[PDB]
Amino acid sequence: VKKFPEGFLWGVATASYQIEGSPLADGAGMSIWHTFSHTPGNVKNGDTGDVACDHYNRWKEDIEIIEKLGVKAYRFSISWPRILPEGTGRVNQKGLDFYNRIIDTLLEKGITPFVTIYHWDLPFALQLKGGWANREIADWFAEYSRVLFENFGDRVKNWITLNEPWVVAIVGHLYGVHAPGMRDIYVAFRAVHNLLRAHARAVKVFRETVKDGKIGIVFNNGYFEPASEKEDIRAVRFMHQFNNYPLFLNPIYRGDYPELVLEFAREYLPENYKDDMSEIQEKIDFVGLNYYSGHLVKFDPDAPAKVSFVERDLPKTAMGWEIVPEGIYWILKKVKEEYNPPEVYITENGAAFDDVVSEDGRVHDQNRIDYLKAHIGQAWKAIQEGVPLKGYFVWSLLDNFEWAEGYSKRFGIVYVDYSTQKRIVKDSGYWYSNVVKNNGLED
Numbered sequence: 001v002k003k004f005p006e007g008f009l010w011g012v013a014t015a016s017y018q019i020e021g022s023p024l025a026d027g028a029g030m031s032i033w034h035t036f037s038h039t040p041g042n043v044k045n046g047d048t049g050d051v052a053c054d055h056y057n058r059w060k061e062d063i064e065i066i067e068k069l070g071v072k073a074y075r076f077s078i079s080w081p082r083i084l085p086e087g088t089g090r091v092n093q094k095g096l097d098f099y100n101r102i103i104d105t106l107l108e109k110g111i112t113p114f115v116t117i118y119h120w121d122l123p124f125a126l127q128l129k130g131g132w133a134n135r136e137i138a139d140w141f142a143e144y145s146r147v148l149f150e151n152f153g154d155r156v157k158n159w160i161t162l163n164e165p166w167v168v169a170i171v172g173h174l175y176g177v178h179a180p181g182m183r184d185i186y187v188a189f190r191a192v193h194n195l196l197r198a199h200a201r202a203v204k205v206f207r208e209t210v211k212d213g214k215i216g217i218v219f220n221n222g223y224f225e226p227a228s229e230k231e232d233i234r235a236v237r238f239m240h241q242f243n244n245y246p247l248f249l250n251p252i253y254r255g256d257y258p259e260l261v262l263e264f265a266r267e268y269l270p271e272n273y274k275d276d277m278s279e280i281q282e283k284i285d286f287v288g289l290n291y292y293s294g295h296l297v298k299f300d301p302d303a304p305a306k307v308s309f310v311e312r313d314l315p316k317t318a319m320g321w322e323i324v325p326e327g328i329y330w331i332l333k334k335v336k337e338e339y340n341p342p343e344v345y346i347t348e349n350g351a352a353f354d355d356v357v358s359e360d361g362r363v364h365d366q367n368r369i370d371y372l373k374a375h376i377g378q379a380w381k382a383i384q385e386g387v388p389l390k391g392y393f394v395w396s397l398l399d400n401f402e403w404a405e406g407y408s409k410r411f412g413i414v415y416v417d418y419s420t421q422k423r424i425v426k427d428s429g430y431w432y433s434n435v436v437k438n439n440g441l442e443d
């Protein structure tokens with residue numbers, strides 16, 4: 001058996017635009033994901049977050065599922081444009097009311113809210129003013145964060161500034177695959193920098209406003225392995241420093257970007273970017289690591305960053321993501337070893353498989369059970385070796401809008417039939433519930 005520490009926080013996670021629907025209900029402003037997904041060609045099948053899981057109406061049912069499963073924490077995000085429809089200035093009480101009801105309900109039921117302040121749905125009004133490219137976003141983000149802290153900080157005690165700021169900057173502004181859909185490397189690195197400045201201003205405001213809570217930040221991470229014994233080792237070093245937590249944690253803890261990020265990208269950063277570093281070093285309470293997959297990596301002279309991925313004959317999810325459970329153990333060990341944060345959480349881990357409802361009314365997702373079990377096991381290991389992991393969040397409670405893939409990728413432990421909005425708890429949800437009840441793995 002593999003038992004976790006007493007009071008370890010087993011959770012599930014979602015994001016506002018991915019589950020809520022009703023993006024313009026009750027005075028909400030447009031988000032960049034609203035305008036991006038309404039632009040032909042940007043999202044698979046023309047899918048949008050207009051309806052999604054209709055969580056905007058079905059929130060109570062969904063929380064009742066969390067409760068019935070005995071899950072002890074819920075990570076969810078707040079839609080900035082529901083709260084401040086123009087990004088700054090006017091506060092929409094109906095946006096506040098929506099999340100107030102969720103928060104109060106979670107607390108009544110003994111579920112710990114973990115709130116992600118920004119999970120990618122930037123107010124469109126602010127994108128018109130350059131969004132993450134504009135230095136002034138540190139101000140706008142601080143003002144938004146302050147509103148949240150003042151309204152909810154009496155009840156919510158666990159906060160996350162940013163979800164996956166690498167993806168926000170690079171996939172949003174370099175690759176152009178996510179909102180706002182830009183392809184400019186100089187804009188992408190200014191977004192990296194402004195994301196850090198905004199994160200730090202929000203933490204600063206948190207300290208003035210919420211005497212008792214904890215605040216952190218969440219990063220995407222891959223387990224990069226070298227294709228050979230060669231510069232392949234260094235291509236891995238670059239991918240780690242660039243794509244993983246060091247891009248952001250080296251500034252936060254050490255006051256500068258990682259060395260190989262600077263070798264690649266110094267020309268793209270603002271000229272006097274070091275001037276902002278002491279403020280960026282604002283103390284954080286925990287690091288959230290998201291983890292899904294491993295990647296074989298090789299030096300490649302012809303690649304845009306001199307690194308290409310090498311396909312491996314390994315089990316993959318419906319995302320095409322190689323299943324490499326030891327990766328979650330590696331990233332946990334590596335974060336302690338490099339930055340030694342006081343607390344760590346796995347804020348997302350999960351898998352997309354092409355789930356079907358069988359004739360028995362059930363979703364027999366043994367592939368997802370196997371995936372989760374293996375990763376929970378590797379996380380257990382890291383704990384046994386002294387990593388201060390305080391919690392683990394399954395992505396996702398529900399099948400949802402998977403960004404540019406639309407509804408075609410199902411990550412839930414709860415199946416959503418989008419034609420009726422019916423929720424069907426998958427085998428993996430029942431399995432996970434038993435994990436949480438037992439506080440760990442047994443066979």
Ligand SMILES: O[C@@H]1[C@@H](O)[C@H](O)[C@]2(O)CC[C@H]1N2
Pocket residue numbers: 015163164167290348395402411
């Ligand atoms: O695929 C996951 C997605 O569903 C979540 O919103 C995210 O936080 C961003 C990409 C990855 N993790």
